[PDB]
Amino acid sequence: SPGIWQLDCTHLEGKVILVAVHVASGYIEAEVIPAETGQETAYFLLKLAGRWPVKTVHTDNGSNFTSTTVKAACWWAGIKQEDGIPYNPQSQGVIESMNKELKKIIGQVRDQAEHLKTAVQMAVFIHNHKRKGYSAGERIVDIIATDIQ
């Protein structure tokens, strides 16, 4: 579980927000792209795997699962690419509830930035620092450090 991430793609303002969630902690990373393509997804995964120890990724749809650019980045970065088929049925609503929470945060900071991408990074910041009692940013560091030790 310490190396498992789920990809998630949601829309806002006619743009796409790509999200990776660290499943055990709830910690997220996200970026605004003009559209989800294999290339953007591959590049986002290379960034993430250079920052955290990403062992397995549950892809968000079957086009990214199939994409040869995505499989090439997974290969390069050492990542097991898996489907994201929610065999535990809890998954669909969990992803939906996160997207709803993210967009709520985004609407709360929205007026503080001209560009969507700034608002999205503010929301990532607020989501990861929120105490729930540790934050997601705390949990992921504790999970992975425990795993190393």
Ligand X SMILES: O=C(O)c1c(CN2C(=O)Cc3ccc(Cl)cc32)ccc2c1OCO2
Asked if 128 touches ligand X (CB under 6 A), the answer is no
Asked if 75 touches a second copy (CB under 8 A), the answer is no
Asked if 138 touches a second copy (CB under 8 A), the answer is yes
Tell me the residue ranges of DSSP E strands in 23-84: 27-33, 56-58, 80-82
Asked if 57 touches ligand X (CB under 6 A), the answer is no
Is 50 buried (19+), middle (13-18) or exposed (0-12) by CB count in 10 A? exposed
Asked if 101 touches a second copy (CB under 8 A), the answer is no
| Rounded distance between C-alpha atoms, residue 30 and residue 16, angstroms | 10
Look up residue 96 and give its amino acid: E
Asked if 21 touches ligand X (CB under 6 A), the answer is yes
Q: CA dist 113 to 28, 33, 53, 124, Å?
A: 20, 17, 31, 14
Residues forming the site for a second copy (CB under 8 A): 29, 43, 46-47, 49-53, 76-77, 112, 117-118, 121-122, 124-125, 128-129, 134, 137-138, 141-142, 144-146, 148-149
Instruction: Provide the binding-site residues for ligand X, judged by CB under 6 A.
Output: 6, 8, 21, 23, 26, 28, 94-95, 97-98, 101, 127
